[PDB]
Write a protein that binds this DNA or RNA. Sequence first.
RNA 1: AGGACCGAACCGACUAAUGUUGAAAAAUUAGCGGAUGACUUGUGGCUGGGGGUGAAAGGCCAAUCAAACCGGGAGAUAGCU
RNA 2: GUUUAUUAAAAACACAGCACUGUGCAAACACGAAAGUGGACGUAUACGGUGUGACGCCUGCCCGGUGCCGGAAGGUUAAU
RNA 3: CUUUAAUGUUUGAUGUUCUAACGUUGACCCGUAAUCCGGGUUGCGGACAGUGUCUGGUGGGUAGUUUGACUGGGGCGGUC
Lengths: 77, 149, 271, 46
Amino acid sequence: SRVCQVTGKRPVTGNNRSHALNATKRRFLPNLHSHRFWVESEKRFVTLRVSAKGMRVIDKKGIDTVLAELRARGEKY
Amino acid sequence: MQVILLDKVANLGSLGDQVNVKAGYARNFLVPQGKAVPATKKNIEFFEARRAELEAKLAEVLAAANARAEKINALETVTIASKAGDEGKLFGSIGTRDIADAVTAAGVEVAKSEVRLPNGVLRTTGEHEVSFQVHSEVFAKVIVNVVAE
Amino acid sequence: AVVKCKPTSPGRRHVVKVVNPELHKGKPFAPLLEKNSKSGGRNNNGRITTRHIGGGHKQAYRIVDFKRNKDGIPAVVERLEYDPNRSANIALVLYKDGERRYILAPKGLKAGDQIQSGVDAAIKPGNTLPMRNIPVGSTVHNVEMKPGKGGQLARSAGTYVQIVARDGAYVTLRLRSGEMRKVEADCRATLGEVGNAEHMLRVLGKAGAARWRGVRPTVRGTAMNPVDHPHGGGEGRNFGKHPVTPWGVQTKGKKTRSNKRTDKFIVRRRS
Amino acid sequence: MKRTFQPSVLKRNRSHGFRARMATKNGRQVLARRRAKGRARLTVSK
RNA sequence: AGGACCGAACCGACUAAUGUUGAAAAAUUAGCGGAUGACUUGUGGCUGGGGGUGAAAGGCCAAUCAAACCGGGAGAUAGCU
RNA sequence: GUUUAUUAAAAACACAGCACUGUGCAAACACGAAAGUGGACGUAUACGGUGUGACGCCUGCCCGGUGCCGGAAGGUUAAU
RNA sequence: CUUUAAUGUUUGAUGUUCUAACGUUGACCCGUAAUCCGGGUUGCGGACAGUGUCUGGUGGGUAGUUUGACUGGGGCGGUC
């Protein structure tokens, strides 16, 4: 897919509509980006694709606090 | 957010200083570089009582690094160190001349530079010469070194 | 050289073909031959992407190298034969080091030439070195975008490019179209021209001649329905409308390609 | 000649097969259809 | 040497005639064109529907192609018969 | 030579040949929710498009409109 | 206080340079007697390209639809 995993934020089919309010969609999507994160515990780079609203929220609970909760919905191989 | 500093780099910082910083210093400078820890209201007491030990015993042999940040964003050096100038004597081996690489570069295409006049780079006391290529027929020799703040 | 096949039969009426003395046959070494060379223009998930592709001889791909990393003891030039998988004439080179390397046969040969590539090379057309040991105004073929990438432009027949600048960081070259672009100074490239120039001087003579060159006929739009491509309106024909691609953009002028990154390294665009 | 049908046994087994159709999800709806309809004739799935 | 000539095979269809409640959902019959290459031919594989494919006619795609097949939506709707 | 399978096989299409135009490889372009793929494991004597059609002799006049391209300096003006 | 200077200063431009982001379609190592891929190591580019959201412009490129009626047939003309 194309999801945040962190906040889960995913593509919806929303529309900005028309000016005569005809049926049309183009989708609103998240801001997924690969940002280079790294565990210290297993000491390697574990680069995740996550949104930039997602990023604000990572900051707000503490970086390694959302990452403290991660690895119970882990993605790494 | 806010931070307790761990460094003194640019015109901010002072080797430990609780200041407010933004999200250009977080996720774009100090972090991600180990050059800060958040200050929240928990941290603010932990780190601060902690920093009057750490940011004392350690601090005074690491002054090289703190300094070079300014010198390389302005540009006047192509040699860098995290210790060098903190005994009267220079330390490291970083520098284009003898790593067989190009570093401290972000506009210049080069990826090689050859060694010319053996003096050592951050291995002889005082300044040393670094010689840096842009062709095999055009050159730019210079006199560079890393010292403490 | 280029020889006219005099009127003898229709389609022989007017033929230009090229015969040259260097053609010697014996087949290059099996490890340096692979496979066939017919594609068809199709994707690797089926369906032809690119029309006008299909046809042509069986061929074999011939496994070529022009990177020329070796700088050891000089080499020698062996046979020459036209390499079908490219637009220029090849020669196998054998190093005395124990290496086999291809070269696109640059003019003035002794079929035993002493290839060495250095940081001054053997200083003769047909040796690769890093593009900083030359002056300006040199002719250079197998210019590259990063060192260790190898040759990729100026690799046809008689394609090479003038060094216009190369002082300070970066090397500007004048590509054959007027196009100045500044590439790195680190990049290798071969001194001197590329060999063969009779690619242009073979101008076939018949329709069938062109079919077996790997290509199928290009059908003009205006001789095809509106829907299939504009400017038609068959029965009695029709004309009108500013000329368009099948992708609907204007074909005449309409400069394309920007990426604002590789464009930052182009210094003067074409006339 | 221009006849629509004329035998190619291979293709039947390998394009209309049990297992030459089982992989695709849609060619499992076909099996499901033709099992619950009581169909067991088999259109050369051997 | 030749998209070379003539001319079987073979690949194909321009004429005419016969057939048209045919031997045939395009034949039979007699000519005809090409007939060493832009050739033609076997096997298998690979392309898909508003798509392919097309030396290009809006041609061709399972006796359907300027409107595919199969199932459903569905009792679409018919001021019409 | 190719062609409206099976009533229109040609003066049609195609064509060597001519000219314009795009495009420096991560190429133009094209395909594909994407990854990625074709172009090409080629690369400006190349790769793609447009129009004309051996060969010969030639290809006049007009840039306004329209398009496209160049100059945009300045002015106008959106979201905010 | 201005005109204007300088101090405490704020900030946008350009300018330069940088990595600490971020990309790499350069080189090398290892997983690996896998040219795929990842990380590592190096080089490069570098706050850029680019993408998310919003936005103006363009956009028969694409789509859904419409484009009235009377009438000595309809057209056509006149008419409402």
